[PDB]
Design an enzyme around this catalytic site. Structure first.
Site, PDB file in Angstrom:
ATOM      1  N   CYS A   1     -18.717 -64.167  36.479  1.00  0.00           N
ATOM      2  CA  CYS A   1     -18.101 -64.469  37.850  1.00  0.00           C
ATOM      3  C   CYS A   1     -16.683 -65.201  36.840  1.00  0.00           C
ATOM      4  O   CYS A   1     -17.266 -65.936  35.500  1.00  0.00           O
ATOM      5  CB  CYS A   1     -18.648 -65.454  38.281  1.00  0.00           C
ATOM      6  SG  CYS A   1     -18.000 -66.038  39.005  1.00  0.00           S
TER       7      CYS A   1
ATOM      8  N   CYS B   1     -21.125 -71.701  43.091  1.00  0.00           N
ATOM      9  CA  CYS B   1     -20.117 -70.137  43.176  1.00  0.00           C
ATOM     10  C   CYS B   1     -18.832 -70.580  43.304  1.00  0.00           C
ATOM     11  O   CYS B   1     -19.433 -70.153  44.545  1.00  0.00           O
ATOM     12  CB  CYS B   1     -20.758 -68.591  43.433  1.00  0.00           C
ATOM     13  SG  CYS B   1     -19.541 -67.646  42.542  1.00  0.00           S
TER      14      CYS B   1
ATOM     15  N   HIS C   1     -24.230 -67.423  39.227  1.00  0.00           N
ATOM     16  CA  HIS C   1     -24.882 -68.688  39.214  1.00  0.00           C
ATOM     17  C   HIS C   1     -24.672 -69.272  40.577  1.00  0.00           C
ATOM     18  O   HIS C   1     -24.166 -69.245  41.203  1.00  0.00           O
ATOM     19  CB  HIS C   1     -23.755 -68.804  38.002  1.00  0.00           C
ATOM     20  CG  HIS C   1     -22.341 -69.529  38.555  1.00  0.00           C
ATOM     21  ND1 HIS C   1     -21.761 -70.358  38.824  1.00  0.00           N
ATOM     22  CD2 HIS C   1     -20.737 -68.153  38.860  1.00  0.00           C
ATOM     23  CE1 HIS C   1     -19.947 -70.055  39.086  1.00  0.00           C
ATOM     24  NE2 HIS C   1     -20.178 -68.834  39.290  1.00  0.00           N
TER      25      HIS C   1
ATOM     26  N   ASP D   1     -15.549 -68.335  37.048  1.00  0.00           N
ATOM     27  CA  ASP D   1     -15.696 -69.263  37.152  1.00  0.00           C
ATOM     28  C   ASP D   1     -16.822 -69.574  35.872  1.00  0.00           C
ATOM     29  O   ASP D   1     -15.689 -70.471  34.962  1.00  0.00           O
ATOM     30  CB  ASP D   1     -17.274 -69.202  37.831  1.00  0.00           C
ATOM     31  CG  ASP D   1     -16.324 -69.491  39.631  1.00  0.00           C
ATOM     32  OD1 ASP D   1     -15.979 -70.565  40.064  1.00  0.00           O
ATOM     33  OD2 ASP D   1     -17.127 -69.000  40.458  1.00  0.00           O
TER      34      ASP D   1
ATOM     35  N   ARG E   1     -19.000 -70.819  34.178  1.00  0.00           N
ATOM     36  CA  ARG E   1     -19.011 -72.029  33.694  1.00  0.00           C
ATOM     37  C   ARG E   1     -20.035 -72.460  32.604  1.00  0.00           C
ATOM     38  O   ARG E   1     -19.350 -73.179  31.893  1.00  0.00           O
ATOM     39  CB  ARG E   1     -20.665 -72.687  34.844  1.00  0.00           C
ATOM     40  CG  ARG E   1     -19.952 -72.701  36.591  1.00  0.00           C
ATOM     41  CD  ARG E   1     -17.797 -73.081  36.380  1.00  0.00           C
ATOM     42  NE  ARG E   1     -18.866 -74.708  37.022  1.00  0.00           N
ATOM     43  CZ  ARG E   1     -17.667 -75.540  36.206  1.00  0.00           C
ATOM     44  NH1 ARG E   1     -16.374 -75.827  35.912  1.00  0.00           N
ATOM     45  NH2 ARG E   1     -18.158 -77.519  36.744  1.00  0.00           N
TER      46      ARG E   1
HETATM   47 CO    CO Z   1     -19.045 -68.062  40.439  1.00  0.00          CO
END
Ligand code: CO
Ligand code: CO
Ligand code: CO
Ligand code: CO
Lengths: 221, 221, 220, 220
Positions: free
Chosen positions: B42, B101, B98, B44, B46
């Site tokens: 993703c 999300c 994850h 994102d 993280r």
């Molecule tokens: Co995500």
């Protein structure tokens, strides 16, 4: 197999080691809930973005594809940009290219690779755009120039998307960057295309190409 | 601005510090010329892939998009997979999802976000696929189940692409993985869809959904 | 040779027209903007102009294999945003056809190459209705899938941000899903017809429920 | 009301046919597989069936705004791979039209939304030929861009992995790029016509060079 089982062991060892130390890492991260940078890099992913920039966890919103392209009609990349700009209200989008890039080289070779070749045609179209420039260069230096011209072209594409145009027309603060790093040293070099509006986009892109067009004679034959 | 100038300073400081130490990093990396893992995660981003897996530099080939999707007709993701599988001869593709999300949550909310919503419709279609399962769950636990079902669905999509089918029909060794990590601990949890062929794809995906369908009562109301 | 035939036909046709003082081209230009968006199949068995007897230039047309509106297809979505946002078309019609090669290709096990990725959306749709289609006599499946496919595509278009935004701002926009049998050319409504989010939800669920009642002559 | 009209027209047409014992549907089914792939514009000013007077079902059809073959468009590439790999079509034709709204939209400064992303490929094409089009009287630009656009799209299709692979394995495949003027309907070859990589390179460069000679009545 062995490899995957290893990975899970590596991961477990790490995650558990983070527990047995009540590690702030996942606390610090969750406090950077929203990213401040969209990073468009290559799937090659040689030197991780987090390592080039040394930004703290969760600061980067990341997209990677082959040869760090922003194709006008790529739904995938555009979604990432529209989400980043409109939902996440990100004010910097970085396109990062890198030397000795597999996609750059493949765009350049004649081998028919299958589906990826279509993806790479946009780089080929770019290669042709600066064919005079690039044939005025040493064959072993062409991939590197093309990598930089690419980045500059991708920024110019980004700044022409309706998402970015519309973010600017509507007042949003949004800056576009285009950088390359040598995989042998990891120095980020700005390629010159930097825009915060449509007018700086155009002026900036013309200047960057003009600047790329003055050759050091250690690049000419 | 201040932020970008900082980034370049951070980067310079790092790259230069790597010089004044004649650092093997860029040597070690160039010896891992070719990646062994395609990582679909993703945007994102993280906890970085490099940190979850602790794989050495250059081992991962990476694609990221919003909510780690492999959409049947996404040229972008497919190019990355076709290049990874056919050119790079990668034998493991990891889809990693994850918790907490942003895309998962946005797929779930009613807000019309613009262009990204279209991208997210595929997650919504999935949410509807397991609507019985998910409405048999606690509202605050739905995003987490949906994240996992997503990953499992994306692996099932990956294993149905003509690229992966054709890599398997033609003898190539290729395994598909679908994992999630909690952003609060970073433990990679396998979601059960793991395939090395078409038959293990189907058996594996049915079993994973079946397994996801048995609820712990700390998930039910 | 095949191309020479086509230029010849084309010359004969367009000259037949000039020397006849044909009001056709003149009349075509007085219809500068279309009123319908028609999203059809590339098989294009009978042309939308023949099915609809519309005046030339009334139709804005997109065709792709099996007449899909895929959530993330830039191409179809570009056609839709332009018809809706720019051309102000107030009717979008998705039109399936029976004996659709696209539908047949989606169901066959055969591995055909890139087109299989395109057709995986159809397979996802076949699975969503695998109970129904599975309660059904296999040789009648393709025709049901043709019709269910159309209903899902309207449901898909109705959910695009572009259509939702056209509806949220009061723009008059209605969606239609039709199929015609290639043996008679009759346009049959599949029941999903939307003028708004709410009407999209209702006729969609309605259309599926009505599609899901099987004639006992076909029931398993 | 507009839809009621269209069902009525459709009924009148398809019944007119049944009660007449029309050989049309019968004849359509004896042409199960098309022989041409036609990639046209959604404006669809005059239909490919009218321009080509081909027998029903001879044409496999894709239409999108401004008749593009974009390198990475799954949709058009799905149509092409299916026509070429599966249907064995040996002729792919790209057909532009003058007074194309897609071409006009690409050149105007106006910000139209998502469709502008689609049309950026045209703008890239306009820039590649900005010298030529810039040596030209601005009011004649759209028509030249219509023609140059077609030539680039053939060059684009000729470079797809799908076409190259069809050529590398000996499959007979030839590409065509035509434009018709909406005022007379005559099909004009734009000169890019390829049966192979080599012939693609030559006619493409040839077509552009011939397109780049301006009539002095339009020269700046
Ligand atoms: Co995500
Ligand atoms: Co690269
Ligand atoms: Co069809
Ligand atoms: Co047009």
């Amino acid at each position: 197999m062995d490899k995957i089982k290893q990975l899970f062991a590596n991961n477990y060892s790490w995650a558990q080691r983070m527990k047995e130390e009540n590690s702030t890492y996942f606390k610090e991260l969750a406090d950077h809930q929203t990213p401040h940078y969209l990073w468009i890099g290559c799937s090659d992913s040689r030197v991780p973005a987090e390592k080039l920039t040394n930004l703290e966890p969760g600061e980067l919103f990341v997209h990677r594809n082959v040869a760090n392209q922003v194709i006008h009609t790529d739904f995938n990349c555009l979604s990432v940009v529209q989400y980043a700009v409109d939902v996440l209200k990100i004010e910097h989008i970085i396109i990062c290219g890198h030397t000795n890039c597999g996609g750059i080289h493949a765009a350049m070779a004649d081998k028919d690779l299958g589906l990826i070749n279509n993806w790479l045609l946009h780089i080929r179209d770019i290669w042709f755009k600066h064919g005079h420039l690039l044939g005025k260069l040493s064959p072993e230096k062409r991939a590197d120039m093309l990598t930089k011209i690419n980045v500059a072209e991708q920024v110019y594409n980004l700044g022409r998307t309706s998402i970015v145009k519309s973010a600017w027309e509507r007042g949003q603060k949004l800056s576009l960057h285009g950088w390359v790093y040598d995989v042998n040293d990891g120095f980020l070099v700005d390629q010159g295309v930097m825009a915060t509006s449509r007018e700086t986009l155009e002026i900036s892109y013309r200047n960057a190409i003009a600047r790329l067009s003055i050759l050091d004679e250690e690049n000419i034959l």
